[PDB]
Structures are given as C-alpha cells and as structure tokens.
Design a protein around this motif. Structure first.
Motif, PDB file in Angstrom:
ATOM      1  N   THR A  67       8.532   7.644   2.646  1.00 43.79           N
ATOM      2  CA  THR A  67       9.326   7.680   1.440  1.00 43.79           C
ATOM      3  C   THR A  67       9.094   8.985   0.658  1.00 43.79           C
ATOM      4  O   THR A  67       8.174   9.748   0.971  1.00 43.79           O
ATOM      5  N   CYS A  68       9.952   9.255  -0.327  1.00 47.61           N
ATOM      6  CA  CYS A  68       9.879  10.520  -1.066  1.00 47.61           C
ATOM      7  C   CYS A  68       9.250  10.229  -2.422  1.00 47.61           C
ATOM      8  O   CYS A  68       9.938   9.844  -3.368  1.00 47.61           O
ATOM      9  N   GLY A  69       7.940  10.403  -2.506  1.00 47.11           N
ATOM     10  CA  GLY A  69       7.179   9.930  -3.673  1.00 47.11           C
ATOM     11  C   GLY A  69       6.950   8.434  -3.533  1.00 47.11           C
ATOM     12  O   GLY A  69       7.508   7.794  -2.625  1.00 47.11           O
ATOM     13  N   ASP A  70       6.148   7.870  -4.442  1.00 47.92           N
ATOM     14  CA  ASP A  70       5.689   6.484  -4.317  1.00 47.92           C
ATOM     15  C   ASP A  70       6.262   5.541  -5.379  1.00 47.92           C
ATOM     16  O   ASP A  70       5.765   4.416  -5.558  1.00 47.92           O
ATOM     17  N   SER A  71       7.298   6.004  -6.080  1.00 50.47           N
ATOM     18  CA  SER A  71       7.917   5.234  -7.148  1.00 50.47           C
ATOM     19  C   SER A  71       8.377   3.868  -6.645  1.00 50.47           C
ATOM     20  O   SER A  71       8.970   3.758  -5.573  1.00 50.47           O
ATOM     21  N   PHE A 115       0.824  -1.203   0.000  1.00 47.94           N
ATOM     22  CA  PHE A 115       0.000   0.000   0.000  1.00 47.94           C
ATOM     23  C   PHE A 115       0.862   1.258   0.000  1.00 47.94           C
ATOM     24  O   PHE A 115       1.840   1.352   0.742  1.00 47.94           O
ATOM     25  N   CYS A 116       0.492   2.223  -0.835  1.00 51.95           N
ATOM     26  CA  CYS A 116       1.030   3.575  -0.730  1.00 51.95           C
ATOM     27  C   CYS A 116      -0.080   4.591  -0.486  1.00 51.95           C
ATOM     28  O   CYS A 116      -1.117   4.564  -1.149  1.00 51.95           O
ATOM     29  N   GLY A 117       0.144   5.486   0.471  1.00 50.94           N
ATOM     30  CA  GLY A 117      -0.776   6.592   0.718  1.00 50.94           C
ATOM     31  C   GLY A 117      -0.026   7.910   0.637  1.00 50.94           C
ATOM     32  O   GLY A 117       1.118   7.998   1.089  1.00 50.94           O
ATOM     33  N   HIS A 118      -0.643   8.932   0.037  1.00 48.78           N
ATOM     34  CA  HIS A 118      -0.038  10.260   0.008  1.00 48.78           C
ATOM     35  C   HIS A 118      -0.174  10.987   1.335  1.00 48.78           C
ATOM     36  O   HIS A 118      -1.210  10.903   1.994  1.00 48.78           O
ATOM     37  N   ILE A 120       9.339  14.102   2.029  1.00 42.99           N
ATOM     38  CA  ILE A 120       8.852  12.807   2.555  1.00 42.99           C
ATOM     39  C   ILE A 120       7.310  12.869   2.632  1.00 42.99           C
ATOM     40  O   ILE A 120       6.745  13.373   3.590  1.00 42.99           O
ATOM     41  N   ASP A 121       6.636  12.346   1.617  1.00 41.23           N
ATOM     42  CA  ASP A 121       5.211  12.610   1.442  1.00 41.23           C
ATOM     43  C   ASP A 121       4.414  11.361   1.117  1.00 41.23           C
ATOM     44  O   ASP A 121       3.303  11.433   0.561  1.00 41.23           O
TER      45      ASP A 121
END
Lengths: 134, 134, 134, 134
Positions: D34-38, D2-5, D119-120
């Motif tokens: 993390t810095c972006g979700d790449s 999972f990634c959330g902004h 870090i977003d």
C-alpha cells in the motif's frame, strides 16, 4: 458498530423502530438483529439488512455459527436517500420479519433462527446517524 | 437472441438506438455490443447491459476470448418498468460508452475492447420485444 | 448439452455414475440432476455442479421455477485435470447428495428439491467428453 | 492489521519476504502492499492478496481512491495449509509483481499503481501469525 439491547428479545407482534439520517455521501450501512452482542466471535445473526448506495441494493442474510445463509435482494425500489431521515420498522411475526421503510412494506425475511426470544440485540454500523431506537 | 448488424462498427460520436417494450412479468434482458455475431463460440463482447428486475440492477460487463471482466453495477436508479415502452441510446465517446434510458444518462462504461470499428453487432435477448433499431 | 434419463428418479442409496475425459484446454463443465429434461424453459435443477478451471472451483447450486438458490463452493481441493479421465459418483442420501470424484468424497449438497423420485434427468454440458453413464 | 514500513518503497528487483504460520482453523488472511499506512481513510492498495480457505482462492485486487479494480483469481493450485508455516515472496519487476509461495511461482499481477517508490507499506491481517518480514 452500535449494539442496543432488546429487553426480552423477539416475539410475534414485536416491533423494532430505528430512525436516523443517512450521511451525505454514503457507501453503505447495516442493521442486524442478533443473538447477544458478541463480536469476537460475532454473535449469530437472525437478519442483517445491508443498504448499498452505489448499486441501490437491500441485501438480507443470516449468520449461524460463522456460516452465511442465502442472500436475498428482491426489492420494489431502493428506499434510502443521502442526507435524508428514514424510519425502519422491523416487525416480528410468527413465520417471518416484515420490514417497513418510511411506513411502506419493502420485504419479508422468513426465519432461519427459530428461537426468537434469543434475538435480543440490534447492531447498527455504517454511513448513517441514529436518532431513535424503540 | 437477436443479432443486428451495425454497418461500419463503432466510432466516437456514433449512437446506437434501441426502442422496445418490456414484458409484463419480466425477469431480465440483455443488450450487448459485440465484435461479429458468432454464438458458438460466442463473439467478443465490448459491453453487455443486463437489466435484472427482481433486485432492480443494471449489470455491465465485457467478454474477451471467453473471459469476463469486472462487472459494474453503479446506478442512480433502475429505469425500466414492466409492460412499458423504453428508449435506450448507447453513445460511443472516445474513452467510454455513455448510456441513456428515456433521455436520461444512466452510466458510463470505459472501453475495454479498444478496436471500436470491429464492434459491429448488437445482441438482444430476454424479456422484452424490440420495436426499433437505429 | 446432453440429457440422459434416470429411470425411476432418485432415492436414498441410489448412485449416479458419470465417467468422462476432461478436454485438453478446459474452461468449465457442468453436471446437473434435474426434474424432467425441458430446456425452454429449463427443467427444475436439484443440483448443478460446475467445475471452473481458471480459479479451480467446484460451484454448486439449484434452480426452482427459474430461481437460483445459494451457490456453494467449499472444497478440500480441485479434483479435475485437463485431458484426464474422471469418475463422478453422485450418491443420493436421505438428507443430501454426497459427491465423489475418483473415489474421494468432495462435498455434500443438502436437498432443496425434496421430491426425489421427480429427479430423473442428468444434464451434461461443457469442456469434456462423456464415456460412461450409469 | 499489522503495518510495516518498506524503506524507499518498491522498485524493479526488490523482493518483499513474508513468513508465517497459518492458524489451525483459518477462514482468510490478506497481505497488501500500500502507499502509506493510512487506515482512515485507507491507503491506496497496489496489490492485495487474500487467501480464502473454504473454497481455496487466492484473490488479487487493487484499491485506488476507495475504488476496487478487477478481481483476479487464476491459480495453478491453492498453496496454504492450516497450522503450517509458509513463505511468501512478492517480487517487484518492471511490469508486474510476481508472487511466490514456498519457492513456487503462483501468479503475476500487472501494475495498476505505476508510481512504485510510493508503495512503501505492507499490511497484513487475518487468520495467521507472522514470523518474518524482510
């Protein structure tokens, strides 16, 4: 990950051939012989060979019901070169696998999984291109 | 272990020379630069280089107040041969040690211990004999 | 490093009792069962238990002819308390050692050294005071 | 994963809240900022917290341009329990992240990535189900 079937599984005298070309900037690759190709959860691993380029290691291990065994690492030299073709031959013998790279013996791995005919899958992942399986 | 004094400690531009002969059937050796020669309880280690022969590793770490840092292992090749003479040069630069074996650059290790002039000891142990220190 | 003799070595049903007090500010300690008390070069280790306080680990391993096996770390909890008395009991069973701390079962360690009567030495070192051996 | 902004990224005084339930038979899970979700190729990691159930570790690290830093592991105890709900709070302060589990402070992680507003992203993976992000 790539999974290839090995018709009839492993027996003493049986050879697995894997040729490929290492990527230009590799971190690692792995070549495993496994019992079936299940990934969820991951098939039992008779032998995993993991080539690590940063510290030039050939790490070997097994996995039985999610449990990792003793990692083995002894090597005469690290046989892989970035951007170069390789030939890996895994030879099944009664007590062990004997692993060759470019025709040279590199290490032996003694069987933890005893039921050889159940070892019927090759799994390949990481920083390489496969050119031949036989 | 052998402990040798380095008069005045380390500074950018200073080079430590270690010449020796690897044993015939070596297991491992280590060469460390340390702040004083205390062994109980051990001196702070600015850099430890451990050569491991079975899997041909050069492992580097530090130790401050008994706490080991992140081990580092990246190598272009393993430089040592059983029963062969070697020449190790540890060059202290401003941000790092640069380590040479037999004239060839093998790795950098960035300074963790910042007070370079306190690094006044070389510690050597394991499967070698030392012929020269300079 | 203290060594104590275990008259007649190990056998199924035999228990080794180690009572002690952890130091006020501990880093680590180790309790081992070994074949003879040779230190240079070090006796074969049937089991080494190493308690590491910083990240609260119980690490187990063996050593045969200077070769370490696979380290084991599985734990239900970390059982030791700085400046607190403890009771370790190592029960030798047919297939394994069963290890108790303060009456509670902590882990099993399966026999790597099979010649149990040759395991006749306890070795203790590190951040503790031993009050009883039996 | 999972990634959330995380809108506007991190700054001192900002709290990240993660609630979930550990799976019944867990091996591990990880929570990262993390810095972006790449993922290809994987975003820089300011902090990864990895809970390992077998030996009860809370392992922390960072990843900058694919290079993992120093793994940190010091813990007062292991806070997670199979099949039980948990509350993780990552407090961003000026010099460090402070991580709380179920209201209790567990560890501090000093900033390696200095650019906090970059870090977003929160990344979550492994043997848990997430019930709240806030």
């Amino acid at each position: 990950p790539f999974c290839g079937h090995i018709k009839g599984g492993m027996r003493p005298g049986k050879k697995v051939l894997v040729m490929g070309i290492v990527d230009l900037n590799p971190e690692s690759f792995a070549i495993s012989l496994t019992c079936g190709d299940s990934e969820d959860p991951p098939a039992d691993v008779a032998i995993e060979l993991k080539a690590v380029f940063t510290d030039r290691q050939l790490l070997r291990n097994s996995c039985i019901s999610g449990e990792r065994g003793e990692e083995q690492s002894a090597i005469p030299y690290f046989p892989f070169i970035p951007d170069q073709p390789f030939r890996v031959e895994i030879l099944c013998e009664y007590p062990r696998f004997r692993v060759f790279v470019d025709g040279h013996q590199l290490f032996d791995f003694y069987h933890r999984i005893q039921t050889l005919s159940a070892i019927d899958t090759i799994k390949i992942n990481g920083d390489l291109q496969i050119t031949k399986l036989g």
